[PDB]
Amino acid sequence: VTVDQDLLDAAGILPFEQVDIYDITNGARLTTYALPGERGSGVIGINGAAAHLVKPGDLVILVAYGVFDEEEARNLKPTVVLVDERNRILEVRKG
Amino acid sequence: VTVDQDLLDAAGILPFEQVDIYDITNGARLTTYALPGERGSGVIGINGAAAHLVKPGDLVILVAYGVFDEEEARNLKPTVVLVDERNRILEVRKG
Amino acid sequence: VTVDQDLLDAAGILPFEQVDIYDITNGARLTTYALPGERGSGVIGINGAAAHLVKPGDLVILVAYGVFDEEEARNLKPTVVLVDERNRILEVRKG
């Protein structure tokens, strides 16, 4: 899944990091990884086999999970990036 | 999945921790994360794309998995929270 | 999934390592592990239950994910092995 790098930057998701895609439009759920897309383009591209399940026009949720030590897990404040219909950042929430 | 925090407390599952949901009513199985819900409300809310698979009225099992060292894994006693039809705690079992 | 070991060598995927298979032909997505196949045979064999979802003639993508420390994750350059219709290596890309 190619993602406008501005969005990866705001989310704190690294290129090549594994991410789950939960499709709001059709309910599909899959695991793949993120690739950096042209900054400011608002691109969200589905490459490969995933194209069978996630289609252009679909509304999706990209989620990244990490492995935490007991201490860091209890202090974790997840980052949530909210975007508009063109995938431009509207707001970023912390924990 | 928003979960009455009293239940998260009893289970030892942290807010934002990844959890699997296995649907007893329809057989759906998915991975998502837990969010703290109002204490004592008995809330079990399905937000986002997961709503396509898990419906209000469904009976479900929420399971959390951790990564253990050899020693801790052999001494592990999983916590099981049993609840009633209103999601109130009936009993908590250890290992 | 039995894989020509020349391909495992080029990819840096170890025998017995867990791998996901994303089917380009039919959209199936599953998790299994790799087994070393005869070198130069170009074998890509689906053994066991996975045979229900991935069929001979299918085009697939085999992906391996690792668990990284913060530092190594930021310097990671994934290996991509491109092959022909007989599963012979055409090119190997780095990051």
Binding site: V3, L7, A11, G12, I13, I24, G42, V43, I44, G45, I46, N47, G48, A49, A51, H52, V54, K55, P56, G57, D58, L59, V60, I61, L62, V63, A64, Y65, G66, V67, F68, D69, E70, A73, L76, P78, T79, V80, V81, L82, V83, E85, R86, N87 | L14, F16, E17, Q18, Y33, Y65, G66, V67, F68, E72 | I24, L82
Partner: peptide, 23 residues
């Protein structure tokens, strides 16, 4: 014990393109 936790997400993004047969 190490815990697997949700650390980040991009919410309600719109898919703009797809390429099943890319390389």
């Amino acid at each position: 014990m190490k815990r697997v936790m949700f650390h980040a997400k991009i919410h309600r993004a719109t898919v703009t393109q797809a390429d099943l047969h890319y390389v």
